[PDB]
Amino acid sequence: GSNQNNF
Ligand SMILES: [Zn+2]
């Protein structure tokens, strides 16, 4: 699956 990390 697609992953996004918004630190
Ligand atoms: Zn994946």
Side-chain angles (χ1 to χ4, degrees):
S2 304
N3 304 280
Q4 186 187 65
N5 292 294
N6 301 305
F7 290 98

